[PDB]
Task: structure prediction
Amino acid sequence: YVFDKITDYTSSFIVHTPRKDYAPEGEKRVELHVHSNMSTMDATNSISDLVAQAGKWGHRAIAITDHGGAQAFPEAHSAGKKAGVKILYGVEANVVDDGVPIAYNDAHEALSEATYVVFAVATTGLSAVYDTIIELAAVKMYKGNVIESFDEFIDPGHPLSRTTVDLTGITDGMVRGSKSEEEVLRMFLEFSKDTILVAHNAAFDMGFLNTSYARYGIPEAANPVIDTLELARYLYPQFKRFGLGVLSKKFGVSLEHRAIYDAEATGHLAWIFVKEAMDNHNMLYHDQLNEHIGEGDSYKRARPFHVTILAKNQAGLKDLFKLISMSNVEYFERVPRIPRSQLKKMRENLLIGSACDKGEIFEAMMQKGVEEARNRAKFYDYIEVMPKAVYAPLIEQELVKNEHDLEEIIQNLVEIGKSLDKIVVATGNVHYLNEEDAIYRKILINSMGGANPLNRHSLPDVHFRTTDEMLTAFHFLGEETAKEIVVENTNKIADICEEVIPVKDELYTPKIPGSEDEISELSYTKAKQMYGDPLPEIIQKRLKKELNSINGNGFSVIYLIAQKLVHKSNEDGYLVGSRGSVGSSFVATMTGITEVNPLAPHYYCPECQYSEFFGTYGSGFDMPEKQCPKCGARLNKDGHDIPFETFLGFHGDKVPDIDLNFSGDYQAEAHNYTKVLFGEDYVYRAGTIGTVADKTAYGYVKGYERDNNLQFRSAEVDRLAKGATGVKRTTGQHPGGIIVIPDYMDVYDFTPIQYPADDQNSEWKTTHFDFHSIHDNVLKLDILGHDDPTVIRMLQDLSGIDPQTIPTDDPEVMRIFAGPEVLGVSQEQIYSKTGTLGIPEFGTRFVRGMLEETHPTTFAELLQISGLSHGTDVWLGNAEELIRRGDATLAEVIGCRDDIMVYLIHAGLDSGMAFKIMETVRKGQWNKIPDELRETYLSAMKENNVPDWYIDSCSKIKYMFPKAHAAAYVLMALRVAYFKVYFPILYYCAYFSVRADDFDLVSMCKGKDAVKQAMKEITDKASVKEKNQLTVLELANEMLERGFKFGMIDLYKSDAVNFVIEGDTLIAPFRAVPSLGTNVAKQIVEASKEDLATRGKSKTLIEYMNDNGVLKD
Ligand SMILES: [Mg+2]
Ligand SMILES: [Zn+2]
Ligand SMILES: [Zn+2]
Ligand SMILES: [Zn+2]
Ligand SMILES: [Zn+2]
Result:
């Protein structure tokens, strides 16, 4: 089979009828237990392909039930709508019994004075139903002292398996000659009279005893019982391990596992436990031992079991989301846990199921008996019986002795269900699609090793089974029973559930009263202040069209939130930049959200509010410095000719998207204000599902071959890797996204919630679903963090210059981009043609060579450089050769999509056609577009006399950067350049303190020679770290060549993270010193050489300073 590379399903190399459901059309099964790749590191197939498979097999419904999550619900919805297959939305939850009693036969005896027969049993196994006691020990204890002892051996007819001979120190001879049970049971019944039975895991030992009793018609002997396991859990929740040995060790009790020892050990503890129960609490009787049960962290110590929960109706889906959210947020231990009481409250619209062999019913039937399974099954709505293979690992694990006993377990479960009038269904616990895939799942598990108990044994065959396979597998039950539990009951369960929709259809934005009016008032107030009450026609038309598009579509909330966030940012003294197309909005400019002005190049008078508008000038900043005609003030200039259609789309029917680069420091404050704005219960950090990628998958595959010692063709490694790829590995938060839920709706109408990476200490909750499926229905606010706003603010603190006052039309920043002669350093010295090292977006070697080659000296030319840099194929094979060959200037070449549109409309082409042409070129689809469309575009361009090179340039373009983000980058660059060109020490301090994280401090402090040698090493090389060090070292060499110097870290002159300035030397932060740490840095700031070492706690860092000359000081 060609998987890229041809696979025979046996091996791989480097140079078919699909599975069919043969059942009749109406007699197809419904698969009710499906695990997708959203079950963390458990299943490997996407829900989409499972749903597609089901749609080819004619099943009328399928159920998605992942392990503790619903993260495959949106993809499942899409797949079910494509395949015409009904989706039942469920989860495989880990449910913990809320209340597990400590005392079993409630009685009003006094614990301090009662007689305890602390007993124990050696066994042939764990299943009281299919294995028997091989020994019986007990110690009658009083007042904490032993009174009597009863130890006996019981001989099973079969020889003891080597497992028992080892687990239990009992051999066949050891019990070769022993009394019959009937007799040993009667002896223990008389011995255990008028006493309080005691056991560790008293459920296990009481079930065995009662089963043995019932084997001879002996009375059940229901005297009061105590389970030391539960008592220890309740009394010492602090412990995380409660096994006898562990507990015996903790409380200093000695044990080798022979029943006699076990018994004496439990007794030596049980005395302590009962004393603690009587003293530390008010439990002086047996009954009082059960009063406080299932209260508190009880969920944390309980052992979860698998349950299947299916949403009955849309209310049921909301309830499943609330249960998933609570299991993630309130009842999480090493897994999302649902207390059984919570599942009972919310079950009117939930069909609860018995799940798999890890369920309560299968566990009870295989280890406790039909009556316990019949009582537990009372709580479920349907019973799940899987084909024997799924239960095959149990036989290999020796839980079920043979195929005869396993057939007895499945048949009993079918009967118990008919008896209680419950739907019994065959499910399949599907974890993969076809059987060739099994190895896919096996290669994924092996990676976890001892973490996954599934490794201890072999994995089952959990593959989607056709209807006939399931029917044939359960045929062992009978003919009118297999067809019932496979086809009829499953379809009955499917018909019970009403159609559910997990994802909404429209966008639900928050409501702020007076938002449209507020946005209009802000925009018009700013416009009047900048251009006068008799507003110019151009600005009038722009504002009217923008505001009609915004307020008309109900998007004023997006702009209003953006405005409040940016205003608060300004009040704290932080500039907010933007990413995307928000700068294309003049309402965004006037409301203060953006600093880019999308208007046409224009002059405006600061005092008269006069105005003149112009495509002769590419941008207003690139215009003569004229003086106001009306008065003597220097006319201000602005405008970058950015249409709003790029942001609000043609016709303005598009949802505004405002990504704001707030400072890295202030992002927390911004998110907290988004909470204040909408409430702590309606804002959630966005969520991302980190999965396994091919590098990791290849690693896991190679690890399997090494561990199992099997060679694979390299191509087989490749095929196996492409198959373990896409499996959920973890969950994360988006870098700065926040999702807001309308106060007239709750999060559960959209998604469950959780903590990122399941960290319960997280200050924010994330959405359970991907932001990629909830962002078309609720507002996703991108409050991103960027280092640029952190640099400008510190430069303002260091210099006082208000950032806005800085002029971006300076006549020396163009010089910075032409050459370093403005800086006062030679190209030979700074090792770069342009003195733009460290100017945001203008210091990468590639972009620096682009500048050296084209020598731009205008704001429009700098925008073209930024576009050439963030566009694929727009330059290396496009405008780099059109410029070197001399065909076109830097200004003429295509650099941004908005530039494409403006030029096509600067020429006679109609605006609508250009928008279409701009979109086509932006999406790298010009080649893809059919000749009819390409011909319309070509004819229009030629009629407007479009230069022939332009069309050729368009054909090779892939992705083109937006013009507004480019203008933001260029403004930040020009402000940081003002300081670099005018106030160098301040610029250098800000850059290092905010961006530089890796300093070869000793080399930088030594002088130029050292930095030069260090750069050579990197030049000869290299790891990401080496190149980061090389960028910091290059800025260091520029600063050193400029006469400024660095200083060694000073105990009384070094800030923890920020460089300090004295003359032309920046004192260095403690953070820079190799691994001086950040917490250690803060501690030093808070504060003999030994005394300093103490405040810091590291001897190794003390040795560093002792060698670099601070400790010498
Ligand atoms: Mg025991
Ligand atoms: Zn699983
Ligand atoms: Zn399960
Ligand atoms: Zn399962
Ligand atoms: Zn004027």
Summary: The CA atoms of residues 51 and 1069 lie 58 Å apart. The pocket of zinc ion (ligand 2) is lined by residues 35, 39, 42, 67, 431 (CB under 6 Å). The chain has five domains: 26-96+302-496, 115-293, 515-564+597-656, 660-788, 983-1108. The longest strand covers residues 728-740.
